[PDB]
């Protein structure tokens, strides 16, 4: 899943987003959000 | 021959025997936690190597943190 | 059951009458009450990550790469810029590219590694912890990237800066961690007491602000006419450190309103409940304005220390502990929030409830500390240790009710971290000594005690060593917390202890006992010369000659200890700066100074750690050898080197000679010299690198257990490999044979030359659970006050449990006991050390001894 | 021709016979007379690497690449290590894998690159300089791989490092060489005095024990119970500089014993001739003893002195110089060898002979500078002065018979470089003095002439603000040498001048008047803003206002020169340790300290260069515009922006408005205030890195050509691009009328605030080489010695000759002009420049002129 | 147009230039010595860029050391 | 031209010589001396 930086942001670039991801195990529910271009 | 003893390039090496925990700095050392007592000490040795050194009580695999100080 | 005093018959049932038929061995499966759902929700899936005996307890648990790369990045593109800016710049990068993690039920939200399971590596402190990790099973992955990284920084890891300047034979001596803890350099271990209060009150854009004001008149006195080259040069590191700064604290806003946007987005998108998607943007919220803006609320308050947690602990270094004064600290806010309503309304029991969320978030703090690191913390993560009551700046009651929510907190959700030390004074309110109470007797093993008086008044003694004459001032030296287990130093929003390089690490006196009686040859454990050659067995013809070998091989190893340490330092300011601390600490920036060049306040200690088995070995080799000549030293040294096999009966002897805790004067004259002389005296001719002394702080905390096991058979009577003493001034498990006042008046005669001594004691349930419980423990505690003891701490925990937990140590999960300094979940423990804590006595009190305490009924 | 002078008629016919009839236009073509076979050949086939213009004269010339790529080869193997160990194992290197070179007939052997022909580059100082190399026909080869060097070094070059620390429009302000300057940190340009006399007295094996017994007292200081972190941390740097040194010295050693053994192959295996095998096996002998072991001779002087030379000067760092007191530091050696013949036995001849060789080695040796430095010493191959004479520790005369041989050898054998300044004292023998004049006489334009009391009382007052309270002892005073053409500085074992950043570099009055008239805008060269705003035209209503304006272009121009070259200090002992120049210093040995961070003896200086035609344009503006009010301001301006194309006879004023040098009242009272007060004066207030002042030392070199064809016409007469003033205090060219003794009279009445001023003198070649030559000039200088000036020096060359020179430059290559502190082959100088020499006035002696100089005949 | 001025990609950048010499400090600047008088001065004008500017006087080749400064 | 190390010397390494070689140009006659192995 990918989501566009908002160009207002402390860590705009451009083409920059965050990918984010939902993950899941025996403990439990978690997402997960890495920096991309 | 029951005590850690040099054999180069030995197929039993301190480093896959149940007894041997790496030493706490240095990971090219080893521990020898074989000397168990029967008051509960455990009386280690001292591994200069632990890929060219063994003894008659190697026994490959691996104790539980719950066997180990 | 019954006791007769003063012409009463105490009965010692239980508060809760239920607990009359409560089997013994399950009691502590009945008493955790999460506050809330949530947090009851967060404790049942908390990802904990105990490590003992040199591994983690879970297979799960596993290292990450995110924080190496990166940092490995940062470092080839930043080669010829000036090495704090370059630092800067490694610990923007990592805040830049990190994955960050959100967790279902979190308010506190934030972490130290790409996943939820994980913890970061640092290949920029010790190349070995890092090949060790490599080796083990939760090396970082790819393990072909990691290794290449590793062999990166190896010339350039502060391992490798350091080594150069010490006798190889000597390093290889305290490498081995028998007679002496390896050096910090070596190792990667470090601590830290975060500047808290200048984040909170002023928030980071203002210290941006700040350092670039400082750069811009920094500039403009470079170009004023007439230059003098005598002093403008000085502003070079200034500007250095101030522009590293500002690359810091910009990094860290960032970082902390990218994890504020994942809450958004994941409330946007992902979670399909409207109270929760309220929730993740109230926490949203509070991230883009925290740490960047002053906090105004508790909420506000909570995660801006947490975020500075993370990057002062785990991100831009690694440090063990948890030091802070969080009443104190986080007064202001309650306030705000609970009290005037003023921003974040809150009732004290959301104040409850958010404290065990923050208990809970540091109980998944994973550490990447090596291996030896993850041997001496058994049952635990890591160190956390905070610091609570005491008094403020005018001599007066620090504990409020802020401090009342931190104790109610640790009591409802029962987790083995964070431990937390009380500061007691005959000033602090009944109300909150009776929180404190109710966590010790349900056995959680905190707080743990601290002489106020003594301590505040270390902090003026070393305030006068200050290298600028700004050390702390009287009322400042109130501001004190432990930096980790046991050692006090100042909180606040200036000269705080920055490193472990100023004062921490340990030496170990059984086994320079051990080799003071070999002429220095370790010939049990490592086979090798370990110390000086102070001389074979015939050249000790009197006690005398035995007593000084053992100050020449302490002598030898101290001074391997702080000059280690020392050098560390030189480094640590010149290639590990610290910009992001350098910035929240107001000396610093105010000189433009490197958190690790600044040392505004003195705190030199080191630790003695298995102390009472080379007092207790001493004392029977004067009775048994010298003064009864029963046996010579070399009938002795033969028993030694067999074990005892075939010489039990000359085992048996010394063994039953006087011992430590006794209150017997044989015994505690000796070993009164011992700590004053040569434990304190000695260790205190030196100075450290801040210009004070340094002086002993004794504990254990699983060292007691490592150290034991490299340290062969000696004249107290144990066997080779058995457990050293578990604290810095209690008797060896099982030779207090007299009752515990005996131990207080044993204990009470050390009162020289001491920084502090960790006293473990184990007090009876049936007493503690009483109604009586409280009077006699606080009896216990204005006595042990007016004794002038440093320390004490209790394990409450019968024997019938633990042997169950040992059994079927799935039945016993919230079995909660005392190690040394620091708490831990029983049956995370390894069996040796179990039974060290079992073996503990069990304290009951004699009418004589409730006499003594002055106790009424 | 002829004069009447008391009464008598001089007769100023030659001294030799046959100079009545031998043409003017050739007389220098006949006057070389090498002292044997071997040096006359040395000199036919002498490989000179002259540059002009900014590029080399013969197209055979070119840079080296074997430097750049062992320099890198070692720092890239080298990284995480002690930045003053990474040096000395970059040096080593490259001594270790250098090719080396023996050229026929040499008996003083070495060079500083692979081959006779070419010259080593510097990645480490400038990048912009290594850059310009590989855009020139004389790049490094291969090309390709000279880039990626450069590219490598570029992060980690000096240039680099000090750049952040300026403004960028100060930078590219510095970085045209028109008003400053450019730092010697963008040009990699630099100086140094050697302490020749520690390598030649002690050998370097000794320098090696006696580093190696430091470091082994430190290391046994830092296991010293009890360590001392305040003191015993001071240990690390001081190992690290030792242990360096050693690395060091231990490569030179090797060095220059494999140089040795290329002698000893070349003789057993290529050259046929018995003779010369036996000489090459003597010298083989002799670089295997030397440097290694103290000197015992004159040939391993001569052979040490050469060895350190390239190391200090080529080989660790690049820079420009000879500075060496010759005869005081080759005198023991000279008396062993030729007056007691207990080594190396030799006659004065032979000494001579040697002498010669060493001039011949000199004008082999290329210089790997930036192109400003390859434009600014047309003629030559770089700066190479030393100097002799003076007086000794008691004040006496220290001219001997190795100062003779020295002389006569550069009479000789007639090479442009090395140039010779000679102390002058009352005390200087005759027999000495003739010898100076013979060189003169020649026209070879050297021994220039210095004041001896003056620099002597410099020395002591200097000495007055060293940091470390050790500066020259008065008796130390009397150890003085010029650094590099003008300004003096302390020669021997210790407190000598390590580097050009303590003093050194220039400023240029002439275009800081220029942008003083137009708001400090450069309309005429970069069309840019080149100082401060100071004031448009129209705000420039009196001439105290013109005054002001050029004070504070001067002050925001000089602030920039010191303080550039303070930030450059800061580096260079961080990164660019001098670990051998650190060796075989005293002080450096003794402490543990780099070369560059030490400075016992302060010494700050900068070089006012076109001073003189500032001054002369504020004469006329005060005369014409002010007092006159015959134009105003615009109309000056007005003409100046037309190249005065319109306004021939406003030019023709300001050109005959009164001018320095002669003696006029108007003139040189507003030009003697100019010196003392401003140019002198407001230097002075500068303190540089050693915590000295700095003052100034007037001199030329050949930026008065290159920043006049920067600078626009001025109000001294000057069309737009042409020649400034020659000197420091010279007479503008062609504008002295009065005659010689006129000249001293206003050369003298500046005496406040110097460092040291240049002057320029050219004097009739009839009188000199008469008869009554040497009474005259001895007379002469007694008077100006009287006068209390700081420096002479002489042109004695005809213009018939210089102008034969410019037709047919090949039948002149013996001539040999003087230019401005250093001497030139003139037709390798640009006809540009040529010109400048012959319009300096040749001057002739009224009977007026003897009688003020109290000549007597 | 007899003034040094921008031309960008120019075949006749001052970088060839007989009357051009590099810049003594760097060699992306350049010393224009077009302007001579007849009184001997080389009035010199700076370069900005070697690469992208040029004049009506442009002329290829190079000067020998004799005619520069 | 191949010259082994002296054994002795103070830059001796196993394999180490000089490789020597004379040349001349217009200038004259000189000999270069390059470490090789
Ligand atoms: O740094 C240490 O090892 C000691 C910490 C403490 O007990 O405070
Ligand atoms: O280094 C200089 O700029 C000049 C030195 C000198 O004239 O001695
Ligand atoms: S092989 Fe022998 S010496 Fe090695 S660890 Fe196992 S039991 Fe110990
Ligand atoms: S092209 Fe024009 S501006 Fe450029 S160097 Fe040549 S004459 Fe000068």
Same mark, same amino acid.
């Given at each position: 899943?990918?989501f566009?930086?908002?160009?207002d942001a402390?860590?705009?670039e451009?083409? @920059?987003?965050?990918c984010?991801?939902? @993950?899941?195990?025996? @403990?439990?529910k978690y997402?997960?959000s @890495?920096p991309?271009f | 021959?029951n005590?850690?003893?040099?054999?180069?390039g030995?197929?039993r090496?301190?480093?896959?025997?149940?007894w041997?925990?790496?030493d706490?700095?240095?990971?090219h050392?080893?521990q020898?936690?074989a000397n168990?007592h029967?008051?509960?000490?455990?009386?280690?040795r001292?591994?200069?190597?632990?890929?060219?050194t063994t003894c008659?009580?190697?026994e490959?695999?691996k104790?539980?943190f719950?066997?180990h100080? | 059951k019954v006791?007769?005093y003063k012409?009463?018959?105490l009965?010692?049932?239980?508060?809760?009458?239920a607990?009359?038929?409560?089997?013994?061995?399950?009691?502590h499966?009945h008493?955790?009450?999460?506050?809330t759902?949530?947090?009851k929700?967060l404790?049942?899936?908390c990802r904990?990550?105990?490590?003992?005996?040199?591994?983690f307890?879970?297979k799960?648990?596993?290292a990450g790469?995110?924080?190496?790369?990166?940092?490995?990045e940062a470092?080839?593109?930043s080669?010829?810029?000036?090495?704090?800016?370059?630092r800067?710049?490694?610990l &923007?990068?990592?805040?830049?590219?990190s994955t960050?993690?959100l967790?279902?039920?979190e308010?506190?939200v934030?972490?130290?590694?790409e996943? $939820?399971?994980m913890?970061?590596?640092?290949p920029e402190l010790?190349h070995m912890?890092?090949?060790?990790y490599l080796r083990?099973?939760y090396?970082?992955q790819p393990?072909?990237?990691?290794?290449?990284?590793?062999?990166?920084w190896?010339?350039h890891?502060? +391992?490798?800066?350091?080594?150069?300047?010490?006798? $190889?034979?000597?390093?290889?001596r305290?490498?081995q961690?028998?007679?002496?803890?390896?050096?910090?350099?070596?190792?990667?271990?470090?601590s830290?007491v975060?500047?808290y209060? *200048?984040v909170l009150?002023?928030?980071?854009?203002?210290?941006?602000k700040?350092?670039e004001? !400082?750069?811009?008149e920094a500039?403009?006195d470079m170009?004023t006419?007439?230059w003098?080259?005598?002093?403008?040069?000085?502003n070079?590191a200034k500007?250095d450190?101030?522009?590293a700064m500002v690359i810091?604290?910009?990094?860290?806003?960032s970082?902390?309103?990218?994890?504020?946007?994942?809450c958004?987005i994941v409330?946007?998108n992902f979670?399909?409940d409207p109270?929760? +998607?309220?929730?993740?943007?109230?926490?949203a919220?509070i991230?883009q304005?925290?740490?960047?803006?002053?906090?105004?609320?508790?909420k506000?308050?909570?995660q801006?220390?947490?975020?500075?947690?993370?990057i002062?602990h785990?991100?831009?270094?690694y440090?063990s502990?948890?030091?802070?004064?969080?009443?104190?600290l986080?007064?202001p806010?309650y306030?705000?929030?609970?009290?005037?309503?003023?921003? +974040?309304?809150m009732?004290?029991?959301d104040?409850?409830?958010?404290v065990?969320?923050?208990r809970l978030?540091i109980?998944?703090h994973?550490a990447?500390?090596?291996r030896?690191?993850?041997?001496?913390?058994?049952?635990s993560?890591?160190?956390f240790?905070?610091?609570v009551?005491?008094?403020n700046?005018?001599?007066?009651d620090a504990?409020?009710?802020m401090t009342?929510?931190?104790?109610?907190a640790?009591?409802?959700i029962?987790?083995?971290?964070?431990?937390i030390?009380?500061?007691?004074?005959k000033?602090n309110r009944?109300?909150?000594l009776?929180?404190?109470?109710?966590?010790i007797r349900?056995?959680?093993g905190?707080?743990s005690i601290?002489?106020?008086e003594?301590?505040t008044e =270390?902090?003026?003694? %070393?305030?006068?060593?200050?290298?600028?004459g700004?050390?702390?001032t009287?009322?400042?030296?109130?501001?004190?917390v432990?930096?980790?287990?046991?050692?006090?130093?100042? !909180?606040?929003?200036?000269?705080?202890?920055?490193?472990?390089?100023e004062?921490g690490?340990?030496?170990?006196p059984?086994?320079?006992?051990?080799?003071?009686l070999?002429?220095?040859?370790?010939?049990?454990?490592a086979?090798?010369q370990?110390?000086?050659?102070?001389?074979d067995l015939?050249?000790?013809?009197?006690?005398?000659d035995?007593?000084?070998?053992?100050?020449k091989?302490? +002598?030898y190893?101290?001074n391997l200890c702080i000059s280690?340490?020392?050098?560390?330092? %030189?480094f640590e300011?010149?290639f590990?700066?610290?910009?992001?601390?350098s &910035?929240?600490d107001?000396?610093?920036?105010?000189?433009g100074m490197?958190?690790?060049?600044?040392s505004?306040?003195?705190?030199?200690?080191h630790?003695?750690?298995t102390?009472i088995?080379?007092?207790?070995?001493?004392?029977?080799?004067?009775?048994?050898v010298?003064?009864e000549?029963?046996?010579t030293?070399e009938?002795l040294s =033969?028993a030694?080197?067999?074990n005892?096999?075939?010489?039990e009966?000359?085992?048996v002897?010394?063994?039953?000679?006087p011992?430590?805790?006794?209150?017997?004067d044989?015994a505690?004259?000796?070993?009164?010299?011992?700590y004053?002389?040569i434990?304190?005296?000695?260790?205190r001719?030196?100075?450290?690198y801040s210009?004070?002394?340094?002086?002993?702080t004794?504990?254990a905390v699983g060292?007691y257990?490592?150290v034991?096991?490299?340290?062969?058979p000696?004249?107290?009577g144990?066997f080779?490999?058995?457990? &050293?003493?578990?604290?810095g001034?209690?008797?060896?498990m099982?030779?207090?044979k007299?009752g515990?006042?005996?131990?207080?008046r044993?204990?009470?005669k050390?009162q020289?030359?001491?920084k502090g001594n960790?006293?473990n004691?184990?007090?009876?349930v049936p007493?503690?659970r009483?109604?009586?419980?409280?009077?006699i423990?606080?009896?216990?505690?204005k006595?042990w006050?007016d004794?002038?003891?440093?320390?004490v701490?209790?394990?409450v925990?019968? *024997?019938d449990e633990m042997?169950? &937990?040992?059994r079927?140590?799935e039945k016993?999960?919230?079995?909660?006991?005392?190690?040394?300094?620091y708490?831990?979940?029983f049956?995370d423990?390894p069996?040796?050390? =179990?039974?060290?804590?079992?073996?503990?006595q069990?304290?009951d009190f004699?009418?004589s001894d409730?006499?003594?305490?002055?106790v009424?009924?």
């Amino acid at each position: 899943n990918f989501f566009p930086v908002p160009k207002d942001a402390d860590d705009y670039e451009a083409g @920059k987003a965050d990918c984010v991801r939902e @993950k899941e195990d025996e @403990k439990g529910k978690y997402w997960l959000s @890495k920096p991309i271009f | 021959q029951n005590q850690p003893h040099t054999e180069v390039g030995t197929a039993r090496p301190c480093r896959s025997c149940k007894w041997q925990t790496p030493d706490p700095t240095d990971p090219h050392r080893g521990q020898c936690t074989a000397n168990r007592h029967a008051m509960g000490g455990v009386w280690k040795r001292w591994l200069r190597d632990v890929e060219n050194t063994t003894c008659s009580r190697h026994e490959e695999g691996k104790l539980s943190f719950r066997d180990h100080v | 059951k019954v006791l007769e005093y003063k012409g009463k018959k105490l009965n010692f049932t239980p508060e809760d009458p239920a607990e009359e038929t409560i089997p013994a061995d399950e009691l502590h499966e009945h008493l955790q009450k999460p506050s809330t759902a949530r947090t009851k929700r967060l404790k049942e899936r908390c990802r904990w990550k105990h490590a003992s005996a040199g591994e983690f307890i879970e297979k799960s648990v596993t290292a990450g790469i995110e924080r190496m790369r990166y940092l490995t990045e940062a470092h080839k593109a930043s080669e010829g810029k000036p090495e704090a800016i370059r630092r800067a710049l490694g610990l &923007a990068n990592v805040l830049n590219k990190s994955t960050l993690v959100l967790q279902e039920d979190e308010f506190i939200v934030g972490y130290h590694a790409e996943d $939820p399971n994980m913890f970061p590596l640092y290949p920029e402190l010790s190349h070995m912890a890092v090949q060790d990790y490599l080796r083990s099973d939760y090396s970082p992955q790819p393990a072909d990237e990691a290794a290449a990284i590793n062999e990166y920084w190896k010339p350039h890891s502060l +391992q490798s800066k350091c080594q150069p300047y010490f006798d $190889p034979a000597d390093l290889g001596r305290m490498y081995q961690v028998s007679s002496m803890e390896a050096p910090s350099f070596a190792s990667g271990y470090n601590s830290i007491v975060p500047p808290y209060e *200048t984040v909170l009150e002023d928030g980071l854009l203002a210290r941006i602000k700040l350092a670039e004001k !400082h750069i811009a008149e920094a500039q403009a006195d470079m170009s004023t006419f007439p230059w003098n080259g005598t002093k403008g040069l000085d502003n070079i590191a200034k500007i250095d450190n101030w522009k590293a700064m500002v690359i810091a604290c910009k990094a860290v806003i960032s970082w902390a309103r990218r994890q504020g946007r994942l809450c958004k987005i994941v409330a946007e998108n992902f979670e399909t409940d409207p109270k929760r +998607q309220a929730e993740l943007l109230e926490i949203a919220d509070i991230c883009q304005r925290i740490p960047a803006e002053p906090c105004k609320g508790l909420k506000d308050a909570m995660q801006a220390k947490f975020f500075t947690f993370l990057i002062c602990h785990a991100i831009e270094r690694y440090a063990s502990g948890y030091a802070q004064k969080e009443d104190t600290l986080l007064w202001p806010y309650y306030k705000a929030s609970v009290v005037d309503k003023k921003f +974040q309304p809150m009732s004290h029991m959301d104040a409850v409830e958010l404290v065990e969320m923050e208990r809970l978030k540091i109980s998944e703090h994973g550490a990447g500390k090596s291996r030896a690191y993850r041997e001496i913390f058994p049952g635990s993560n890591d160190l956390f240790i905070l610091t609570v009551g005491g008094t403020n700046a005018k001599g007066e009651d620090a504990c409020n009710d802020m401090t009342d929510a931190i104790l109610e907190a640790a009591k409802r959700i029962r987790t083995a971290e964070p431990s937390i030390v009380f500061r007691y004074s005959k000033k602090n309110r009944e109300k909150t000594l009776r929180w404190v109470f109710e966590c010790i007797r349900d056995g959680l093993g905190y707080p743990s005690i601290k002489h106020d008086e003594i301590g505040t008044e =270390q902090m003026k003694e %070393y305030a006068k060593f200050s290298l600028n004459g700004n050390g702390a001032t009287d009322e400042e030296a109130h501001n004190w917390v432990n930096v980790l287990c046991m050692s006090p130093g100042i !909180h606040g929003r200036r000269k705080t202890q920055k490193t472990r390089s100023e004062g921490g690490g340990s030496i170990f006196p059984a086994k320079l006992l051990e080799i003071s009686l070999n002429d220095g040859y370790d010939w049990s454990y490592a086979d090798m010369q370990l110390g000086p050659k102070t001389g074979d067995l015939s050249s000790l013809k009197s006690f005398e000659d035995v007593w000084e070998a053992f100050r020449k091989q302490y +002598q030898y190893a101290i001074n391997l200890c702080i000059s280690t340490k020392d050098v560390s330092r %030189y480094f640590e300011q010149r290639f590990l700066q610290m910009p992001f601390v350098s &910035a929240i600490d107001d000396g610093c920036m105010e000189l433009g100074m490197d958190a690790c060049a600044l040392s505004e306040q003195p705190n030199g200690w080191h630790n003695p750690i298995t102390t009472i088995v080379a007092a207790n070995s001493l004392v029977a080799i004067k009775k048994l050898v010298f003064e009864e000549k029963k046996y010579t030293l070399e009938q002795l040294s =033969q028993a030694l080197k067999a074990n005892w096999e075939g010489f039990e009966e000359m085992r048996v002897d010394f063994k039953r000679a006087p011992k430590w805790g006794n209150d017997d004067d044989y015994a505690d004259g000796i070993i009164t010299r011992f700590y004053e002389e040569i434990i304190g005296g000695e260790m205190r001719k030196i100075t450290n690198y801040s210009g004070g002394p340094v002086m002993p702080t004794g504990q254990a905390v699983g060292l007691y257990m490592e150290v034991g096991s490299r340290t062969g058979p000696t004249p107290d009577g144990r066997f080779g490999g058995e457990a &050293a003493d578990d604290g810095g001034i209690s008797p060896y498990m099982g030779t207090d044979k007299k009752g515990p006042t005996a131990v207080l008046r044993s204990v009470s005669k050390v009162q020289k030359n001491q920084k502090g001594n960790l006293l473990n004691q184990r007090l009876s349930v049936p007493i503690m659970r009483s109604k009586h419980g409280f009077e006699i423990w606080n009896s216990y505690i204005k006595t042990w006050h007016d004794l002038n003891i440093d320390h004490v701490q209790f394990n409450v925990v019968s *024997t019938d449990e633990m042997r169950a &937990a040992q059994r079927e140590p799935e039945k016993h999960h919230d079995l909660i006991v005392r190690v040394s300094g620091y708490s831990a979940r029983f049956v995370d423990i390894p069996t040796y050390g =179990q039974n060290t804590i079992i073996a503990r006595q069990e304290q009951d009190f004699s009418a004589s001894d409730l006499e003594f305490l002055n106790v009424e009924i």
